[PDB]
Design an enzyme around this catalytic site. Structure first.
Site, PDB file in Angstrom:
ATOM      1  CG  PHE A 107      -5.733 -64.713  15.533  1.00  0.00           C
ATOM      2  CD1 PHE A 107      -6.919 -64.058  16.395  1.00  0.00           C
ATOM      3  CD2 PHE A 107      -6.057 -64.453  14.180  1.00  0.00           C
ATOM      4  CE1 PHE A 107      -7.790 -63.592  16.064  1.00  0.00           C
ATOM      5  CE2 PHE A 107      -7.194 -64.152  13.749  1.00  0.00           C
ATOM      6  CZ  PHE A 107      -8.269 -63.464  14.487  1.00  0.00           C
TER       7      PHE A 107
ATOM      8  CE1 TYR B 208      13.398 -60.198   7.131  1.00  0.00           C
ATOM      9  CE2 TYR B 208      11.601 -61.403   5.991  1.00  0.00           C
ATOM     10  CZ  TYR B 208      12.258 -60.996   7.110  1.00  0.00           C
ATOM     11  OH  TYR B 208      11.825 -61.479   8.465  1.00  0.00           O
TER      12      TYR B 208
ATOM     13  N   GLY C  30       4.804 -73.205  12.970  1.00  0.00           N
ATOM     14  CA  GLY C  30       6.071 -72.466  12.355  1.00  0.00           C
ATOM     15  C   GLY C  30       6.925 -72.551  13.656  1.00  0.00           C
ATOM     16  CE1 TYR C  31      12.573 -72.077  12.596  1.00  0.00           C
ATOM     17  CE2 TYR C  31      12.248 -70.093  11.365  1.00  0.00           C
ATOM     18  CZ  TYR C  31      12.906 -71.227  11.505  1.00  0.00           C
ATOM     19  OH  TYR C  31      13.946 -71.595  10.863  1.00  0.00           O
TER      20      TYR C  31
END
Ligand SMILES: NC(=O)C1=CN([C@@H]2O[C@H](COP(=O)(O)OP(=O)(O)OC[C@H]3O[C@@H](n4cnc5c(N)ncnc54)[C@H](O)[C@@H]3O)[C@@H](O)[C@H]2O)C=CC1
Length: 405
Positions: A80, A241, A58-59
């Site tokens: 992880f 969110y 991802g980012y």
């Protein structure tokens, strides 16, 4: 028979999770991201010694690639991930990091990684140890962790994040990607324990602990820069969110960055910023069943404007425009913004209009659900050009300079 130890890896979806990953496709996906960066070209005046916390997918992976192959940085990554075993493919982040180490070496760049719980003091100490042995200090710290849980390093209490509104219950429309049906569900409001726990997991405390650890141990350079990633989105996602439990956590970040900036700005003019990024497909998209629907709509709308982007395009421009350049896209609380094309009024107006029209029958006429599904599979190394998915592969891909916590 080498075949005893190899296998043909295919996607296996248990509900909304893909529990397999293809090492060759993950490698190819990393190389596609590297090749985007090298094609756009170098970024001047970037950090040369970079720690990325959450560097495997991802980012955070995009930041690691941008720093290394755009800015020419030596990179230490923390993540992880599950290694592969015979008959049991590892996680995509494991294979992504294996590829990163491979390509970094080819370019003569340092790449060391630490696999372990970044919330713990021990991993912070291993990371400090690695900087001391290898880099002396780091110039930049990217904080890009995403987890549903945090084991507190002092008390040992296990906090679980909640993904719920606050105040009133809400009816959230969403897309069940298994059934391929539009479905609405009512989420109850978060309890105070759920709020506090979400702030503990995805708030800014651990970010702060990281920076104070590197400072106390002296491995943070005079004036270093640090940024943590966040999402704000627009009204359609506001209830769950920005204004919900996870949003209370992100709101802890606009407060923590100020104390972090104070510490760095006395240290040779360093700086700290919350960096706001656009919505993208990630491994746990469907953690809110709203997100597959929102993404499918957003993709189509932004593709029609020529502004659709993924992780690497976003973070490359964050580095070039804001972290390193003189177009720092600043907002009113002092956050770096890379999400402005998603928040374009007309985009959001179009997504909103389509949100109210989409049904089980017109999903493929009104949305880019096709693109959502392809980009989802791409995360795990599936659907990648030039990969031979009929070939046996050994799932036990090893990583040099991988410190196991
Ligand atoms: N649409 C999106 O996915 C958006 C995400 N963001 C932000 O970007 C950041 C990264 O999110 P994503 O890329 O979505 O997630 P991700 O799931 O792709 O990756 C999370 C990273 O954290 C690592 N990690 C998780 N738990 C760990 C632990 N206990 N110890 C060490 N490493 C651990 C994983 O290995 C991985 O490297 C987050 O702060 C998120 O809020 C911002 C805007 C939108």
């Amino acid at each position: 028979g080498s075949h005893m130890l190899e296998m043909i890896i295919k996607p296996r979806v248990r509900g909304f999770i893909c529990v397999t990953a293809h090492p060759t496709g993950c490698e190819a996906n990393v190389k596609k991201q590297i090749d985007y960066v090298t094609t756009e070209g170098p970024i001047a005046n970037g950090p040369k010694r970079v720690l990325v916390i959450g560097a495997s997918t991802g980012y955070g992976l995009a930041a690691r690639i941008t720093a290394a192959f755009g800015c020419g940085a030596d990179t230490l990554g923390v993540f992880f991930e599950r290694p592969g075993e015979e008959g049991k493919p590892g996680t995509s982040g494991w294979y992504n990091s294996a590829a990163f180490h491979k390509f970094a070496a080819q370019k003569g760049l340092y790449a060391k990684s630490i696999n372990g719980d970044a919330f713990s003091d021990e991993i912070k100490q291993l990371t400090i140890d690695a900087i001391k042995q290898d880099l002396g200090q780091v110039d930049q710290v990217i904080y890009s962790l995403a987890s549903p849980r945090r084991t507190h390093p002092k008390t040992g209490e296990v906090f679980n994040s909640a993904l719920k509104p606050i105040g009133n219950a809400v009816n959230l429309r969403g897309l069940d990607t298994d059934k391929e049906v539009i479905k609405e569900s009512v989420l109850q409001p978060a309890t105070q324990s759920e709020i506090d726990s979400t702030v503990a997991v995805m708030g800014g405390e651990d970010w702060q602990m990281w920076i104070d650890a590197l400072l106390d141990a002296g491995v943070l350079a005079e004036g270093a820069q640090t940024t943590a990633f966040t999402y704000l989105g627009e009204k359609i996602t506001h209830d769950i969110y920005w204004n919900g439990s996870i949003g209370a956590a992100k709101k802890d970040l606009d407060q923590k960055v100020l104390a972090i900036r104070e510490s760095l700005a006395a240290h040779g003019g360093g700086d700290a910023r919350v960096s706001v990024l656009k919505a993208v497909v990630g491994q746990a998209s469907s953690a809110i069943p709203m997100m597959p629907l929102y993404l499918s709509l957003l993709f189509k709308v932004m593709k029609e404007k020529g502004t659709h982007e993924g992780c690497i395009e976003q973070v490359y421009s964050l580095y070039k425009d804001s972290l390193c350049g003189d177009s720092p896209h600043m907002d009113q609380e002092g956050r770096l913004r890379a999400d402005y094309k998603e928040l374009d009024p007309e985009v959001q107006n179009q997504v909103q209009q389509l949100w109210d029209q989409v049904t089980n029958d017109n999903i493929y006429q009104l949305t880019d659900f096709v693109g959502y599904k392809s980009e989802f599979l791409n995360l795990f190394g599936f659907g990648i050009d030039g990969v031979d998915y009929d070939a046996d592969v050994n799932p036990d891909v090893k990583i040099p300079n991988l410190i196991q916590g």
